[model samples]
Target: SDLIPAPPLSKVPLQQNFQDNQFHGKWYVVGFAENIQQREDKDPPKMIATIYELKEDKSYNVTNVASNWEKCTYRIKTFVPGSQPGEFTLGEIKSRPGMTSYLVRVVSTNYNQHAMVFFKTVVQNREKFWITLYGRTKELTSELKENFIRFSKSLGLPENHIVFPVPIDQCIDG
Candidate 1:
C-alpha cells in the first residue's frame, strides 16, 4: 500500500503555462523520492545529473546519470507531450521488462531555478510512484526544498523516503 501514492494526480495542479522550450536544459538533481524503503545497505543515490533536450514535436529527449556510489548508471528517456500543459508520458523502457508506460507531470517550476515533478509507472502489474526536485545549479533555495517535501508527503511518501543526496562536484556533470 505504501507503494501507491495517496493523492490522485488529478488533484495536483500542473505548472501554469509550462513550456518545453523553457524547461529543456541541463539540470542538477538535488533531490529524489521513490516508492522504496530507505536502507543504508541498499542502493542509495549518491549523486545525479540530467539534461533535457526539446524536440521539434514538443517532445523531449532526456538523459540522466545516477550514481549509487557502486556505479554510475546512465539512461535516456523520450518525453511525449500530453494533452495538458506540464504533462508528459515517457516512452517505452527497452532495458527492463514491464507491462505499462510511465506518466510524468510537472507539479511546479520556474524554469530557471527549480522544478518539482512527479511520475507514475506500472511494474509487474503494480503501480509505482516517483518524484524529483531539479535545480539549475547544484544548490537550490530552501523554499523549494520545503515545497518538495510537502508535495512528497501529500503523495504518501514517508520522511525517510524523500532523499536529498550529498552534492558532489564531479559526479557526471550534465
Candidate 2:
C-alpha cells in the first residue's frame, strides 16, 4: 500500500497577528500544490513573481507579472480585508465565470524570508483548495522547502502533490 493515497485535511488553521503592512511587498513564487486529483498528474505550471502594493485605504493592489511562456500579461487583483484580521477576499476570477470569490489567508509568514498561503473557493458545489509557498527570491533555500513540505503534509496534502515550478527571470519587472 505505498501507492495508497492519504485522506484530505479539513480547515487548516490561519496565521495569527498577521500584519498587513509587513506583508506588503514583492514576493516570488517558490513552491506550489493543489488538491485536485487531475492537476496532480500534470507538471507544475510556470509562475511569475507577484507584488503586493498596499493602498492608502488599507486595501492591496496585487499585480501578477506574466510567466515566461506568456508575455505582456500583467493583471491586477484587489484584496479586501475580511472580518478577521488575517482573512481576505480575493478579486473575482474573470475566466471562471461562476468562481464567485476566492478566500485567502496568511497561513504562515515571517514577513521577510518566506510565506505560506492558503486559498479556498467554491464553484457550483465543488470546493477547491490550493497552497503556495512564496519567498523573497525566486529560488528557495533547501531549509525553506523542507518546512513547506512539513506544513503541507500536516494539512493532509500528499507528498507527491507538492512541487516547485521552474523559476523565471524574464518578467518585464521583478
Candidate 3:
C-alpha cells in the first residue's frame, strides 16, 4: 500500500513525435514529485540539473547533477529508446546496486522552454514513481508550474510529496 501502481506504457500520455536531437542540452529541474512511504524515507534534492548527450546508436548518454544542501552528487547513465518515440528505458545504474530497468517517458515537452519527464523504478521490491518538471531557465512560468502539480497529482502523488526546488547557483562547473 506504500507504492503507487505505475501506469501502463500505453496509458502514459507521451510526447508526440519526440525529437531526441532537439531534446539535447541542459535542463534545470524546477519541480520533483515522488511517492514516499515514510517521512524518514524522503531525501529530496534541493536542486537538480540534467544534461543529455546524443550517441550514434540512438541512445543518450545522460549526466545528472543534484544538490542536496551543500552536497552535490553525480550520476551518469544511458537512456535507450524502444519502438515508441517518447518512451525510453534506463539500464542498470551502477551507483545504486540492484537498481535496474527504469522506465522513462517524456510526458510533455515543447522542445524549448519546458517539459515533464516521468520515471518508474522498484526499490526494496516496491515500485516508486518520480515526475520531474524541467525548464530551460532556472525558473519556470507559473502556468507550467501548475501543470506539473496537476499532472503529478493525477498520477496519484500526494500534494506534500511534490516540491519546487530552488536553484543552486554555481553548483557545477564544466
Candidate 4:
C-alpha cells in the first residue's frame, strides 16, 4: 500500500481482468498525466474530459466539460480489487461511501489495449499519474504512441504532463 501496486492476485483478474470494455465510443484524449495540474489553476474551465460510459451497472462515467463560468461535471468511477498488480480501488460510482481512493495499478490490459497506473492515494505521494495508455483507437499508433510514452516515462511522469492528442485522422473532412 505504498499507495498502490500490489495485485498479482495469483495473476490478476478477480475483476477487470478481461473481456467487455466498450466504453460507448470516441475516447480520444491520448494523454492526461494529471497531478492536479498546477493545483487546478483555480479549478474550473476544463471544456471537456470524457470517459463516456461502460455501464450496465459496472459504473464508469466521468464526464467533465466546463465553461459558462463553469459547470458540467459528472462522476461515476468504480473499480475495486487491490491485492496486487498495480492494485485497485478507484471510487465513487457504485458502492459509494467516503469515496476518493484510486490506487488502480494495472500497467497493462488487453482486449484491444489497456494500461493502468494511477495514484490519488489521498493526494501527494507525488507520483503524478499515468500507465493508462489506452487503445480502441481514436488514433494512437506510432508503436502505440511510443508505448504510451514509454509507460509514462517509467512512472516518473513529466514531459510537460504527457499530452499528445490531435489525431482523428487529423480532424476529418473527407
CA-lDDT, candidates in order: 0.79, 0.76, 0.81, 0.44
What does candidate 1's lDDT look like per residue over 1-174, in tens digits? 345443677766688988889998888888898777666466555667788899887888888877655566778888888878888877656555874757888988889899888888877878787889999888888988998888888887888888887677554673
Clash count, predicted structure 3: 0
Off by over 4 Å in 4: 1-119, 122-130, 136-139, 147-151, 154-174
Ranking by lDDT: 3, 1, 2, 4
- Runs in model 2 lying further than 4 Å from the true structure: 1-11, 38-44, 68-70, 93-96
Residue 139 lDDT in candidate 4: 51
Poorest stretch of ten by lDDT in candidate 4? 165-174
Q: Candidate 1: lDDT of 79?
A: 82
Order the candidates by TM-score, highest first.
1, 3, 2, 4
For 57-149, candidate 3 gives per-residue lDDT tens digits of 988988988765557778898888966897887755556666655788999999899999999887566677889999888898899999898
In TM-score terms, candidate 3 sits at 0.85
Model 1: clashing residue pairs?
none
Which residue pairs in model 3 clash with each other? none
**Which candidate should be chosen as best, given lDDT against the real structure?**
3
Better candidate by TM-score, 2 or 4: 2
Q: Per-candidate TM vs. native?
A: 0.87, 0.82, 0.85, 0.25
TM-score for predicted model 4 compared with the true structure = 0.25
Q: After superposition, how far is residue 100 of candidate 2 from its true place, in Å?
A: 3.9
Could you tell which candidate, 1 or 3, scores higher by TM-score?
Answer: 1
Which of the two, 1 or 4, has more TM-score?
1
lDDT of 4: 0.44
